[PDB]
Amino acid sequence: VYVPDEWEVSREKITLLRELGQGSFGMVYEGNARDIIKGEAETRVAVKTVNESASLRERIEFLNEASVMKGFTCHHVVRLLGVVSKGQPTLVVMELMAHGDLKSYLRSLRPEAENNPGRPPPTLQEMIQMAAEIADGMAYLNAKKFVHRNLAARNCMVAHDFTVKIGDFGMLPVRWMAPESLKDGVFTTSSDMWSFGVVLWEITSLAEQPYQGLSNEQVLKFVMDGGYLDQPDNCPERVTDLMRMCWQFNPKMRPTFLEIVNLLKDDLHPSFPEVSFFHSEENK
Ligand SMILES: COCCN1CCN(CCn2ccc(Nc3ncc4c(n3)-c3c(nn(C)c3-c3ccccc3)C[C@H]4C)n2)CC1
């Protein structure tokens, strides 16, 4: 049972512009929110909805996810801005990530891409920046005692200034799963580290399908036998080294998300210590 609180916004303050794509509970829209953030007259938003066919229990669960998001204040995790519980349909207002999911964004930077924005593919500097941003958001989730369980490029988001953030998470994708998860169903921050390595592989391959040519049955056998992804053509050695650390068979040998940020801290944008969880007073 959900009880309305301080975060609640009036229904008519949100104007929906267009559909973005299907979410877990229903359709996600691109919208504009009137006076949602202090100092901002209008804010570009992503509005999560519950579809008509869903149950009251499913509608309550959606609002309980919004209650959880209230305590999340990381710059590298997509933030909740407000909620609408009174009436029908149920709404959850998130910050808009202007360039959408990381997978779709990486595919658009390919030479053959019909929707190429006239920009080059990610530079080594940009790849390292993305890696640290994803790892910082994941370090924040881990400090919050949450295991993602579904980390992949399709789940990471790109902001207007190209900042990468963790989208929706765990409050089968066999090609991103750690050997212990494929075998025993064990999901931890260490299995999330394995998936992070696959995300790095997606960045360097411009969102190619992992283990292309191998079926879901062959991926399961290959990964559990100690097999891992081959490095993509012209992959920078620094990113390859990160992938290898992520792909250790024993989850105990894999680095932590904070250790990843610590390995990359010196080669980042000057704003990183001003916005990161790693450099915040919360990282203790
Ligand atoms: C040159 O390329 C062509 C131009 N492109 C066209 C596509 N354009 C990009 C469009 N875009 C999609 C989405 C989103 N921005 C966005 N911000 C925030 C969210 C979501 N989307 C979101 C949410 N749940 N779900 C499920 C999604 C979702 C993801 C991918 C696709 C659909 C929906 C909730 C929060 C996390 N922005 C970027 C510019």
64: CATH = 3.30.200.20
Do 73 and 131 reside in the same domain of the chain?
A: no
Distances in whole angstroms, Cα of residue 54 to Cα of each of 28, 47, 139, 272: 15, 17, 33, 41
Which bin fits 206, alpha (ψ -120 to 50), beta or left (φ > 0)?
Answer: left
Residues 92 and 106 in one domain: no
| Apex 270 CA angle, 262 and 164, nearest 5 | 70
Residues 102 and 227 in one domain: yes
| 112 and 246 part of one domain | yes
Q: Are residues 114 and 234 in the same domain?
A: yes
Query: Which of 97, 156, 206 has most ligand 1 atoms within 8 Å of its beta carbon, as the pocket-test mutant?
Result: 97
Domain containing residue 224: 97-284
Question: Are residues 64 and 106 both part of a single domain?
Answer: no
Nearest to 19 by CA among 51, 43, 41: 51
Beta-bridged to residue 65, according to DSSP, are none
Q: What is the Cα Rg of the chain in Å?
A: 19
Same domain, 19 and 142: no
Of 96, 114, 132, which closes a domain? 96
Q: Which atom of ligand 1 is nearest to the CA of 99?
A: 38
Question: Hey, what's the torsion of the CAs at 235, 236, 238, 243, to 10 degrees?
Answer: -10
Same domain, 172 and 221: yes
Expt. technique:
X-ray
Nearest CA to ligand 1 atom 9: 100
| End-to-end Cα distance, the chain | 34
Answer whether 47 contacts ligand 1 (Cβ < 6 A).
no
Q: Do residues 251 and 190 touch, judged by C-beta distance below 8 A?
A: yes
Are 164 and 243 part of one and the same domain? yes
The answer, yes or no, to whether any atom of ligand 1 lies below 6 A from the CB of 46, is yes
How would you label 243-280 residue by residue, b for 16+ Cβ within 10 Å and e otherwise? bebbbbbebeebbebbebbebbeeebbeebeebbbbeb
Which CATH number fits the domain that encloses residue 145? 1.10.510.10
Question: Do 87 and 103 belong to one domain?
Answer: no
Domain boundary among 76, 96, 116: 96
Number of domains in the chain: 2
Atom index in ligand 1 nearest the CA of residue 115 equals 1
Residue 260, ligand 1, Cβ within 6 A: no
Return the bridge partners of 165, or none. 157
Within its chain, how far is the Cα of 199 from the centroid? 10
Whole-number Å distance between alpha carbons of 111 and 16: 34
> Which of the listed residues 101, 162, 206 should we mutate to test ligand 1's pocket, taking the one with most ligand atoms within 8 A of CB?
101
Task: Resolution in Å, one decimal, please.
Answer: 2.3
- Say if CB 155 and CB 167 are below 8 A apart: yes
User: How far apart (Å, rounded) are the C-alpha atoms in residues 195 and 150?
Assistant: 8
Q: Which two tokens stand for residue 220?
A: 């399961």
Q: What is the token pair recorded at 132?
A: 């640290």
On whether the CB atoms of residues 133 and 112 are closer than 8 A, the answer is no
Q: Do 108 and 89 belong together in one domain?
A: no
Length of the chain, in residues: 284
Smallest CA-to-CA distance from 123 within 155, 162, 168 is with: 162
Instruction: Determine whether 98 is exposed, middle or buried from the number of CB atoms within 10 Å of its CB (0-12, 13-18, 19+).
Output: middle
Query: For residue 62, which of 38, 95, 30, 88 has the smallest C-alpha distance?
Result: 88
The β-bridge partners of 31 are 16, 45
Alpha-carbon gap, residue 227 to 204, rounded angstroms: 19
Report the residue numbers after which the chain has a gap, meaning the C atom sits over 2.5 angstroms from the next written residue's N, or none. Answer: 171
- 3-state per-residue secondary structure call for the chain: CCCCCCCECCHHHEEEEEEEEECCCCEEEEEEEECCCCCCCEEEEEEEECCCCCCHHHHHHHHHHHHHHCCCCCCCECCEEEEECCCCCCEEEEECCCCCEHHHHHHHCCCCCCCCCCCCCCCHHHHHHHHHHHHHHHHHHHHCCCCCCCCCHHHEEECCCCCEEECCCCCCCHHHCCHHHHHHCCCCHHHHHHHHHHHHHHHHHCCCCCCCCCCHHHHHHHHHCCCCCCCCCCCCHHHHHHHHHHCCCCHHHCCCHHHHHHHHHHHCCCCHHHHCCCCCCCCC
User: Which residue's CA lies nearest to atom 31 of ligand 1?
Assistant: 21
State in Å: Cα 243 to ligand 1 middle.
27
Choose one of 71, 96, 121: the last residue of a domain.
96
Residues 57 and 82 in one domain: yes
- Ligand 1 midpoint to CA 259 (Å): 30
